[PDB]
Amino acid sequence: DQGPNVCALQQILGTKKKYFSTAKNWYKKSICGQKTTVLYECCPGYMRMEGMKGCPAVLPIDHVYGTLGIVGATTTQRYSDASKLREEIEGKGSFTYFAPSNEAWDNLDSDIRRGLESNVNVELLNALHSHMINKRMLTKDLKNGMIIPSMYNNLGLFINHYPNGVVTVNCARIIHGNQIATNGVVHVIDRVLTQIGTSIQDFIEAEDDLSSFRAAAITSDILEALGRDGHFTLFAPTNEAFEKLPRGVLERIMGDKVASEALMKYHILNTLQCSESIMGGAVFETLEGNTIEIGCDGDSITVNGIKMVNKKDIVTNNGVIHLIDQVLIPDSAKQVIELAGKQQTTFTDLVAQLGLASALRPDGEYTLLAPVNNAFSDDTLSMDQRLLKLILQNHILKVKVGLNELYNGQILETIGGKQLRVFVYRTAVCIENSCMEKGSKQGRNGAIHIFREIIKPAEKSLHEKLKQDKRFSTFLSLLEAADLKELLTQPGDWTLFVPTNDAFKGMTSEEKEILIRDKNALQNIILYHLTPGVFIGKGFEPGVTNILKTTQGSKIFLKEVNDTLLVNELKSKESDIMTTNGVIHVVDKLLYPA
Amino acid sequence: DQGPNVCALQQILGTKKKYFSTAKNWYKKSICGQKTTVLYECCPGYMRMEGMKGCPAVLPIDHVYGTLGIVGATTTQRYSDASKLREEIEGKGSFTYFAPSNEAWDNLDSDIRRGLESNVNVELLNALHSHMINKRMLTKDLKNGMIIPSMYNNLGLFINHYPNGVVTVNCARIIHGNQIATNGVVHVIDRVLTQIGTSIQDFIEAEDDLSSFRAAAITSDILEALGRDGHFTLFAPTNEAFEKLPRGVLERIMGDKVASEALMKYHILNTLQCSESIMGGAVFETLEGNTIEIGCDGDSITVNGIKMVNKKDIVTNNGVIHLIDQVLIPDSAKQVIELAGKQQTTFTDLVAQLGLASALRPDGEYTLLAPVNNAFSDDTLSMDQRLLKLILQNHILKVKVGLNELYNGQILETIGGKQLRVFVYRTAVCIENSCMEKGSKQGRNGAIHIFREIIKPAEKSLHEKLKQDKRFSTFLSLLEAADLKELLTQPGDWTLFVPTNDAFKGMTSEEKEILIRDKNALQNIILYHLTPGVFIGKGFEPGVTNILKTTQGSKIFLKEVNDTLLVNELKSKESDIMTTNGVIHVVDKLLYPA
Ligand SMILES: [Ca+2]
Ligand SMILES: [Ca+2]
Ligand SMILES: [Ca+2]
Ligand SMILES: [Ca+2]
Ligand SMILES: [Ca+2]
Ligand SMILES: [Ca+2]
Ligand SMILES: [Cl-]
Ligand SMILES: [Cl-]
Ligand SMILES: [Cl-]
Ligand SMILES: [Cl-]
Ligand SMILES: [Cl-]
Ligand SMILES: [Cl-]
Ligand SMILES: [Cl-]
Ligand SMILES: [Cl-]
Ligand SMILES: [Cl-]
Ligand SMILES: [Cl-]
Ligand SMILES: [Cl-]
Ligand SMILES: [Cl-]
Ligand SMILES: [Cl-]
Ligand SMILES: [Cl-]
Ligand SMILES: [Cl-]
Ligand SMILES: [Cl-]
Ligand SMILES: [Cl-]
Ligand SMILES: [Cl-]
Ligand SMILES: [Cl-]
Ligand SMILES: [Cl-]
Ligand SMILES: [Cl-]
Ligand SMILES: [Cl-]
Ligand SMILES: [Cl-]
Ligand SMILES: [Cl-]
Ligand SMILES: [Cl-]
Ligand SMILES: [Cl-]
Ligand SMILES: [Cl-]
Ligand SMILES: [Cl-]
Ligand SMILES: [Cl-]
Ligand SMILES: [Cl-]
Ligand SMILES: [Cl-]
Ligand SMILES: [Cl-]
Ligand SMILES: [Cl-]
Ligand SMILES: [Cl-]
Ligand SMILES: [Cl-]
Ligand SMILES: [Cl-]
Ligand SMILES: [Mg+2]
Ligand SMILES: [Mg+2]
Ligand SMILES: [Mg+2]
Ligand SMILES: [Mg+2]
Ligand SMILES: [Mg+2]
Ligand SMILES: [Mg+2]
Ligand SMILES: [Mg+2]
Ligand SMILES: [Mg+2]
Ligand SMILES: [Mg+2]
Ligand SMILES: [Mg+2]
Ligand SMILES: [Mg+2]
Ligand SMILES: [Mg+2]
Ligand SMILES: [Mg+2]
Ligand SMILES: [Mg+2]
Ligand SMILES: [Mg+2]
Ligand SMILES: [Mg+2]
Ligand SMILES: [Mg+2]
Ligand SMILES: [Mg+2]
Ligand code: NA
Ligand code: NA
Ligand SMILES: [Zn+2]
Ligand SMILES: [Zn+2]
Structure with missing residues (x-):
């Protein structure tokens, strides 16, 4: 004891x-x-x-x-x-x-x-x-x-x-x-020692259950490397493993030299890991460069959370081999729609169900913008599936765009013909109304990104959004009195705070004739409510005050707290209203630089 | 703040x-x-x-x-x-x-x-x-x-x-x-990027200050390996570094292919370590297989505690190079007497001063048994230096014996002609009267071990040690009455506990005529004091009781506490008295199996 x-x-x-x-x-x-x-x-x-x-x-x-x-x-x-x-x-x-x-x-x-x-x-x-x-x-x-x-x-x-x-x-x-x-x-x-094998290559060529895998190796010219000296860990998919794959996928990966080479290298480790060395979860860099997660449950060795290992610890001169029931497929060998995970299934299913799946060709380069399953509500899926298909067409790009390739002010072309504005902030990247989450991946023929919301390209401009609501009427007049109509009609990037007519009624209309006399002061009071560039509350980091220079030149402060935008420490009524040439934040009271 | x-x-x-x-x-x-x-x-x-x-x-x-x-x-x-x-x-x-x-x-x-x-x-x-x-x-x-x-x-x-x-x-x-x-x-x-070098080999061949090092590389055929792809860290000794070596040492190492190859590989790392990656002490395995300790003091890079680095971070295609003021010499390239450290200096000096240093030839294979500097007292160094030379001759072997090659009961031959008994215990290894410490090293032409005491081969047998002291007289008679004289005279391995005549006087000599009547009981009482094999208190692990089977067959217990041997929980007077055929422990009272 x-x-x-x-x-x-x-x-x-x-x-x-x-x-x-x-x-x-x-x-x-x-x-x-x-x-x-x-x-x-x-x-x-x-x-x-x-x-x-x-x-x-x-x-x-x-x-x-x-x-x-x-x-x-x-x-x-x-x-x-x-x-x-x-x-x-x-x-x-x-x-x-x-x-x-x-x-x-x-x-x-x-x-x-x-x-x-x-x-x-x-x-x-x-x-x-x-x-x-x-x-x-x-x-x-x-x-x-x-x-x-x-x-x-x-x-x-x-x-x-x-x-x-x-x-x-x-x-x-x-x-x-x-x-x-x-x-x-x-x-x-824990075991009786046995004769060491000639090498990993010699065992692959000698083994019939590796007959499939062996073939792929000769196609990628990586089999010769497995016959030289070294310390390797090879997870060898059996013939059962390749037969468990979807039909045509093995043919498509084999037909492509890059996909086959990356697939092969994904099964190989540069160090010798015996099964008995694994007491728990760890990550290992493969020869393809992506990591596999090796672990154990009981006496069963697990790879990427799945237990594929039946025969293990086959020791050769140049390393160890463990047989697996599946085929490890790296993201680099995958078609773009296969890069989606659990939370993308709805998206993955929708593009398949509405006829957009075949539209992603192996010969092309595509980008999927994938809202999480939580971004599809019942009212969303209740709409006619053809309008839904039009919405999904805004989530597919006919060019591959990596997360590292994005930049502020970039415009993307959807396969549906529309155009998406890219807004790059310090802590966030927002395409149109929706902002990116973590978990972007790059595949063989494209890349995929994850969004919190469904992307809805804004169909109306600043001026159109202004004149279609009555509560903004007075303010719109002032904007037209400032000769800003041409700015609100034409394209650009703007952040506009719109006080409701309820704010001007707090002046009882007498301050409207008082300030209507000043031509110059109206330009200041109005231009303080406009800022160059599109700044949306979802893109800010929470709790942080944002110092922005208005087109008037005086500073204005934007702080997003509890998903509520605060302009100069005043809670906005409506926030993040997307237009074509800018964004609208509705405020309760009239703003002054102070 | x-x-x-x-x-x-x-x-x-x-x-x-x-x-x-x-x-x-x-x-x-x-x-x-x-x-x-x-x-x-x-x-x-x-x-x-x-x-x-x-x-x-x-x-x-x-x-x-x-x-x-x-x-x-x-x-x-x-x-x-x-x-x-x-x-x-x-x-x-x-x-x-x-x-x-x-x-x-x-x-x-x-x-x-x-x-x-x-x-x-x-x-x-x-x-x-x-x-x-x-x-x-x-x-x-x-x-x-x-x-x-x-x-x-x-x-x-x-x-x-x-x-x-x-x-x-x-x-x-x-x-x-x-x-x-x-x-x-x-x-x-922290620095402006510059053109990358062709390779480490090309920089060595191009550099004149590496002219010496380059030569050695071509002798070891390790220069071609430094022209291929990889990520390397090379500490390059300059011409100053080789000129700082003792005369003839570079010639001796170069004349030997193994010493030159190991020396070369000792300067190379299999990974790329930039100077700016070093925030403190770490150990790195070289291509020779021994580790070097890399560290930093201020902005000076240190190797093995010394700061040899003047020019650092010379970046080539296949790795990085740092220039050093010294030559890293692995133990495998060193002559045996060069393997000694600080605590061996006295020994290292004594064999040099008394004429035994030249007696270790590069063509031979030797073992040094080196007592620490604390093992040489003033009375020791006060003896005539020729007797001291005879003692040192018992600390040198004309065969290389590694720590992994030792075994219990082994006999070693000193260059002085005498013979050393090896006693292997569970936690300790003792040659004759002295036990080994940690820090054994193996060099090119031999190996070196460290001892707590000076090795003094026992010149007297059990019987001789018995009859030369009067306090043992009675006991010796009993041993001769048991017909054990032939065992005490002839060689063997024995542990003998000798009660002094003070122990027999506690019986007032009447129990000597009482037990003198029993022929059989005297054999038991006597044979209980003898055990096969040599067990010395220095070799035990402290505090642990040792169960030994005496030649009588009943168990006896030996526990070394505070460097004092306790036999059956009785403090011995004198302990670890070495003889040729065994060891003697003097006890206060007569021992019984009980
Ligand atoms: Ca056991
Ligand atoms: Ca250990
Ligand atoms: Ca912006
Ligand atoms: Ca700085
Ligand atoms: Ca980092
Ligand atoms: Ca022994
Ligand atoms: Cl037990
Ligand atoms: Cl162990
Ligand atoms: Cl582990
Ligand atoms: Cl363990
Ligand atoms: Cl636990
Ligand atoms: Cl279990
Ligand atoms: Cl997933
Ligand atoms: Cl449809
Ligand atoms: Cl990406
Ligand atoms: Cl990339
Ligand atoms: Cl690039
Ligand atoms: Cl960017
Ligand atoms: Cl940081
Ligand atoms: Cl970002
Ligand atoms: Cl609308
Ligand atoms: Cl645009
Ligand atoms: Cl700043
Ligand atoms: Cl200000
Ligand atoms: Cl500051
Ligand atoms: Cl950093
Ligand atoms: Cl460090
Ligand atoms: Cl740091
Ligand atoms: Cl500190
Ligand atoms: Cl300093
Ligand atoms: Cl030392
Ligand atoms: Cl002398
Ligand atoms: Cl050794
Ligand atoms: Cl060895
Ligand atoms: Cl061996
Ligand atoms: Cl041994
Ligand atoms: Cl342990
Ligand atoms: Cl030991
Ligand atoms: Cl003596
Ligand atoms: Cl002997
Ligand atoms: Cl046991
Ligand atoms: Cl007993
Ligand atoms: Mg057994
Ligand atoms: Mg296979
Ligand atoms: Mg092993
Ligand atoms: Mg194992
Ligand atoms: Mg989804
Ligand atoms: Mg910046
Ligand atoms: Mg208004
Ligand atoms: Mg815009
Ligand atoms: Mg907001
Ligand atoms: Mg600068
Ligand atoms: Mg040199
Ligand atoms: Mg670097
Ligand atoms: Mg550096
Ligand atoms: Mg010494
Ligand atoms: Mg044992
Ligand atoms: Mg006696
Ligand atoms: Mg002996
Ligand atoms: Mg003792
Ligand atoms: Na910002
Ligand atoms: Na023992
Ligand atoms: Zn600004
Ligand atoms: Zn025993």
Whole structure:
């Protein structure tokens, strides 16, 4: 339980994976998404005493052979006895012994096991020697990437040492490390070591279930790179994996050299990751340059949250291979409409249902502006689907435009023929009335961006929006008295604050004849309400006051708080009213520079 | 000071290095061994308001050209104006601009600066374009290892992004990142970008001050590897560095292919480390496999605690080069006596002063057993230096023996002809009377180990040590009565507890005639005091009770506490008395199995 020299053997619940370590102060952390059942006992070689907590007493060390029995491997001991390796590891020298546990021998192929028991003198001794090193090497001495010649024919032992502490030999993890023996050190490993493969390329060419994948490799000329030296991690999709793909998609990706090359590189890692090195979620950069998320649930390895791994830890000379049930497809190999996620499904479905899906050709370059599913209300989907189709046509571009390519004042051409204004702010980018969210992606034939609202290009100008509402009438007169009608009719970029007639009625119309006498002061009072450029409340960062220079030249302050626009610390009635040449914010009272 | 949108510009005290970041909650940490002077001001574009803490107000963004002046680069602005780049970066598009600060232009070579002012239309525009990217890329979008084509002739911009947050372009660090502009983003870099070198090999061959180093490379055939693609960090020793070496050492290392190859690889890193990425101490694995410790003191880069770096951040296509004043010599390229550290100096000096230094040949393989300087007392160095030389001859072996090659019961042959017994325990390794410390190293021609005490091979056997002290007399008789004289005379491994005659006098000699009648019980009582194998108190782990099986078969317990051996929880008088065939522990009372 607790005390000196107490060792804890953890087993991940629902799995056969076991971790042995000294009982420290903090190891109740769960591994691979599951908690563990712990088994407390004296560390091997240590003994309990009467009336004493823990195991204060220790037994003298033995040689490597006796240590095999000390660490709990009876089967490795017996095979060492039958092959007459016992007398070597009891004798003079220094030996590191990587000893499969009893379970590890149980999991060995029965024909291979009886095949080793068939010849004890040669084959069994050669395998056990393949498990050994000519000098004593503790776990700290086993460094990631080391290739250590074994005691049989100088067979390479491929060492991996990971930040989490996992140490593996040919991807076999060391459960119980550093058992000190007079003759050397004994480590217990979770599997029996096997002959190393020629290379990843040779395994792909030799394997029939990789027949599909192999083909694609030869098309991308990336198979030759997998036959040279290195440390790789290859997730190999099986024939089942390619047959699980939608019809024609594999043909379309194979027909394109860039899509095939990127697809291939997306399955490869530049480092050697054994399955036993994964205790949880992590991100790895593939050779394509996008990252895959590798994790574990129980004993099942997960890739991008899905568990595709059936056969794992196939160790070759140049790296490790894990078989997967699916095909990892990077965004760079995907058609644009395939870049959409969960929150775009409605959009993704609508363009498919209303006949715009076929309109995105593989030979073209397109941009999807995709409102989230929350941006489609019931009243929206209640409209006649042909008007809805016209609205969706404003969300598709016939040119690919990346998020890094956008700029303020840019105009985009929808496939529906209309024009979208781009407004770039410091913290936000808003196309027409709708502003972008995070999560833009770029595919093979185009790019996709995500919007909070449905994009509705403004059909009416400033002047038209002014003369169509009665509450603005007086103000419009003043704007026409200022000779600003031509500005309100013609295109441009403007931010206009419109006081309602309710604001002029606060002056009881007598200040209208008072200020009607001033020709110059009317120009100041009016021009203070107009600012160059379009500034909408959705684009501001919340809580921040915005200092803008009006066309009158005096400063005006715009602060969006709780999705409510405040102009000079006065709450606006209506805000963000989009026109063709500008934006309108309706205010309660008449504005003065002050 | 404090508030919203407050930005802090730190300057490392005693250096011109500057770091700009938003005022967060914790950045008072010192950089590169020194504290910083901080300058608080509103983040560019943000403004103070009356009665408000911090800078709650923000100004609208400008284009890239205006942002140059916003971020504080007037010189980049002026050069952009003179080359007519201004009208491009004020216009339509999306531009990332890496803008040298004013200081960065000041540090540019005056002939290069006036040389750019000489032609504004072509050369200046081509350099400024070499500082720019065709799309907007924030610092998070700049990934380590990226090569991004610039806007002049698709010149590669080599991006590096380090865990500490440092982002560099051609090793130029970005002081102020992510200034958002309508036309793109502006980053401020600490130096003017320059033409990238052909490769590291080409720079070595072109440089005369590397003439020495270049030669060694061609001898090790590692120069061709430095001409291929990759990301490297090369610390290049100058001609001064090789001339600073002891005479004949460079010739000896060059004459040996393994020493030269390891020496060369020890100067190379497999990753690109810019000088500006170093905020403090870190360890890096070289191509030789040993690690070098890289750090910084002020603006001086340190390697292995020494500051050898004068010229730094020489950027080529395949990596970076930093010039060093010394030659990094790995242990694998060193002669054995050169492996000694500070605490071995006395030993290192003694073998040199008494004539044993020349006795270690480059053609041989040797092992040094080196006591720490504290292991030489005044009385030790007061003895005649020829006897001292005989003692040192027991500390040298004519065969190389690694720490991983040692095993219990091994016998070593000193060059002085004597023989050393090796005792391997679980937590300790003791040669004869002295036990090993940490810090063993392996060199080219041998290995070195560190000991707490001077090794003194035992000259007397158990029987001789017994009959030469009177206090043991009675006990010796009993041992001879048990027919154990032949065991005490002949070689072996034994642990013997010797009760003094003071213990038998506690029985008043009447129990000597009482127990003298029993022939069988005397064998038990006597044989309980003898155990097979040599167990010394220095080798035990402190506080741990040791269960040993005596040659009588009953258990005995040995616990070393406060450097005092306790046998069955009884403090021994004298402990760890070394003989040829065993060890003697003197006890106060007679021992019984109980
Ligand atoms: Ca370790
Ligand atoms: Ca175990
Ligand atoms: Ca704007
Ligand atoms: Ca960042
Ligand atoms: Ca700055
Ligand atoms: Ca021993
Ligand atoms: Cl489970
Ligand atoms: Cl541990
Ligand atoms: Cl947990
Ligand atoms: Cl137990
Ligand atoms: Cl035990
Ligand atoms: Cl070896
Ligand atoms: Cl672990
Ligand atoms: Cl371990
Ligand atoms: Cl050993
Ligand atoms: Cl992990
Ligand atoms: Cl998703
Ligand atoms: Cl339809
Ligand atoms: Cl994008
Ligand atoms: Cl891009
Ligand atoms: Cl933005
Ligand atoms: Cl309307
Ligand atoms: Cl327009
Ligand atoms: Cl003002
Ligand atoms: Cl300093
Ligand atoms: Cl920041
Ligand atoms: Cl500090
Ligand atoms: Cl300020
Ligand atoms: Cl400012
Ligand atoms: Cl580009
Ligand atoms: Cl930083
Ligand atoms: Cl930064
Ligand atoms: Cl932009
Ligand atoms: Cl650092
Ligand atoms: Cl030192
Ligand atoms: Cl001498
Ligand atoms: Cl060593
Ligand atoms: Cl070695
Ligand atoms: Cl040890
Ligand atoms: Cl003596
Ligand atoms: Cl001996
Ligand atoms: Cl007992
Ligand atoms: Mg043992
Ligand atoms: Mg076993
Ligand atoms: Mg491995
Ligand atoms: Mg396949
Ligand atoms: Mg594994
Ligand atoms: Mg949607
Ligand atoms: Mg009105
Ligand atoms: Mg507009
Ligand atoms: Mg608003
Ligand atoms: Mg700006
Ligand atoms: Mg400047
Ligand atoms: Mg760089
Ligand atoms: Mg040189
Ligand atoms: Mg740098
Ligand atoms: Mg010394
Ligand atoms: Mg006696
Ligand atoms: Mg002995
Ligand atoms: Mg002692
Ligand atoms: Na012991
Ligand atoms: Na703004
Ligand atoms: Zn303005
Ligand atoms: Zn024993």
